[PDB]
């Protein structure tokens, strides 16, 4: 009895991205940036996903790594 | 022939208003020297050493006596020093006032009668 | 347009110069009322300075108002007369 | 005995102001456009007094925030 | 928001000039340790006064403005660094 | 729209309040530290002669004793003398506290402002 | 033209004439201080409180209406050049007063 | 126009340096002038900041030279800037002209 | 041509913004120095006070209060009656000139 989402906005490749700069102070720092370039993707698909359906339809083309993750939610997206 | 004229009538007004504010300008100039010369008679009068109530940027006041006249000081250009003398701050910063006051005419004679032309074609415009 | 618009100008400044004195003096209170010009000091009008216990300093602080505030009500009562 | 108040358009579309160029950030314009709407149908309970309006006309558009408001204060707009 | 630029132009600008100014108050103490540098009488202000006494003890409000100067205007540098990379 | 004439209107009479405000502060910061740092000692230490202004032109020598007296005016008819410890204390507020509101209504208006 | 008179005494016989315009809706008074200077803020609440210069006309004609009749009853007709509200209008069709509005010139 | 509008901007920058200078040359020649002659009076000392220092009359009359040797040479430049923006002022302004016409 | 006495009357109706400007400043100064000379006698009851240009205060005796109080008001008081020698004068200048002009000129 799967409950549906209605989605048209989507997650994929080379969208979007975050024009940080950070100076040097050690070797962790810098995943700070890569972090940022999705982090807002990942708390997205996440709640949305958790919102209380349980399939989700997207009007414009998605991801296989959002595929992945959405398998992650234990989940499948069209 | 008029529409053109008119229309180019109001960047003249303009800069006539802007050497209207130049002679605003002019008003304004003068009180610095104004309340020098007003200050003139204080040096004259305390030229023993006299207690003063003095400012110390603009909002601060605190007593002191003045002293040593022979090396009274005004600033000038980039950082260079007028030390008046004792005679000076009692007579002769008067004719220093005088120059100052002559670069004042500077100011408003010969400013003022090369504005009479200003005022001219004020006059004229309403040809 | 400019007959009416420089007369009603300038009578409205004539008075709204000394509504922004009155301004002044009721900002210039606040030493009084908070920061307390009670004690024997070396105060000032202006060109003196006198070293005298502030017991004028009231009705010297009161007398202004009672003269602006009666202009500036005459001059805002006065922008009502013709339109 | 609903002595109609009579009124053109009192009420407007649609509207969202712009920071700049682009668009402002904010629902608070909403959020007090509504209160606003639902103090002035308060101030029609009250003027009932003077104006004895049960019903009112307008050209303009309403949402369902003015159908609930006029539920609770049992009034019609066209 | 690219706010950057009103929120760094003004820092940088005043941070030149007082860096300009601090560097003018170092030629000011090289030249009072060499030009007119007489232990008798030599006129020094802090802030509205001189006093015609300080020779050596110049250095007490030489190093007071120079460390006052240069630890905040690097330090204010770093906050428009701080504002730049906020932003990018 | 009148979005941009609005806009610049605020911006420029709210730089106007920039350009005052940021004009009294560096001589209320003058008063504070030119005192604290010079007289606070010296003057307390021992007379010497000294500088002080005549007029905003006229700079005339002078000498103080430890007079130790200082008065302020906020304007041309009230005045209060004070000590040389209390008066910096009274005077210290008027500057770092005041500058945290008003420069904030002024970095934080400013930031408001470019979207209200 | 007329006037917002509701069952005025239309045969006014007695009628005494005097032409002069009587400000019953006084034009709200929008110059203070020119044109949109910062001062408009008295602009905005100037424009106002001109409801009491058309009460204290209507007062005037009242005791002009006095002098002239010695009572309420004759009608006395004045005229005005531009429009004059109903509601005082309500209460001079029964004082024996007869003001009309929107005159024209010659 | 750009080149116009531009030529026009590096007159006025110019131009407003320039009159500053004049108007504290205007005192400055004169108070030097009566300077070098009426010694005892008034003595050259160079107040660079608050500090003093006592100087002499020779490189101060350099320093004034030279400021009229730089703001004279200013003046060329930016009447240089002035038959630059004459000339652009026909073709760079032609330009939009000639679209508009044809 | 007429447009030179044009000019002229002209030129006299500047001189007539000239003379309002010309005694409307020194009244207005003349009215401050009422107010300060009416301060200055209510303030004399005390003693120990200073006086200066408003950039200095210098200490004096209650004697140097009573001649400063007098010898800078008299001076401004003989500066009102210069004006008023020199007002009437220039008055008489634009008034007569008016006179004789505007109802002369347009002929």
Known sequence: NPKIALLNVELELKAEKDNAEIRVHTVEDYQAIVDAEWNILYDKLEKIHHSGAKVVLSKLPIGDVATQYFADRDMFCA | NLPQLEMLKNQLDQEVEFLSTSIAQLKVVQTKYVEAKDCLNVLNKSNEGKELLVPLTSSMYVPGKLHDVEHVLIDVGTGYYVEKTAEDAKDFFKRKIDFLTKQMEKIQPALQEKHAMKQAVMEMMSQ | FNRLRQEQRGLASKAAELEMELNEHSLVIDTLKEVDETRKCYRMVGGVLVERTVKEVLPALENNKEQIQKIIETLTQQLQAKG | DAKIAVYSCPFDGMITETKGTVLIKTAEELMNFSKGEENLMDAQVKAIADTGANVVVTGGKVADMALHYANKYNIMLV | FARNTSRITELKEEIEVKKKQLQNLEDACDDIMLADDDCLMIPYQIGDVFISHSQEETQEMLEEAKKNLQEEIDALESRVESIQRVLA | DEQYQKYKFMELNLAQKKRRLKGQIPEIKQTLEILKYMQKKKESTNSMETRFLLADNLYCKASVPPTDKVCLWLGANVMLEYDIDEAQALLEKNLSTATKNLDSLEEDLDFLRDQF | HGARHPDMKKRVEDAYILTCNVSLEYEKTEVNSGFFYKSAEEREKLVKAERKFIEDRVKKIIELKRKVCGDSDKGFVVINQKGIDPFSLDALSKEGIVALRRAKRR | ?102 | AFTELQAKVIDTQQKVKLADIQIEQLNRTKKHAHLTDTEIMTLVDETNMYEGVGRMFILQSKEAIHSQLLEKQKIAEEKIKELEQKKSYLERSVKEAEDNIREMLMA
């Open chain 8, 1 to 102: 126009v750009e080149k116009y509008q531009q030529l026009q901007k590096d007159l006025s920058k110019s131009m407003s340096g320039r009159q500053k200078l004049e108007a504290q040359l205007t005192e400055n020649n004169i108070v030097k002038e009566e300077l070098a002659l009426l010694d005892g009076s008034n003595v050259v000392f160079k107040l660079l900041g608050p500090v003093l220092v006592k100087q002499e009359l020779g490189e101060a009359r350099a320093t004034v030279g030279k400021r009229l040797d730089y703001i004279t040479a200013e003046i060329k430049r930016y009447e240089s800037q002035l038959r630059d923006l004459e000339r652009q002022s026909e073709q760079q302004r032609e330009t939009l002209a000639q679209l508009q016409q044809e």
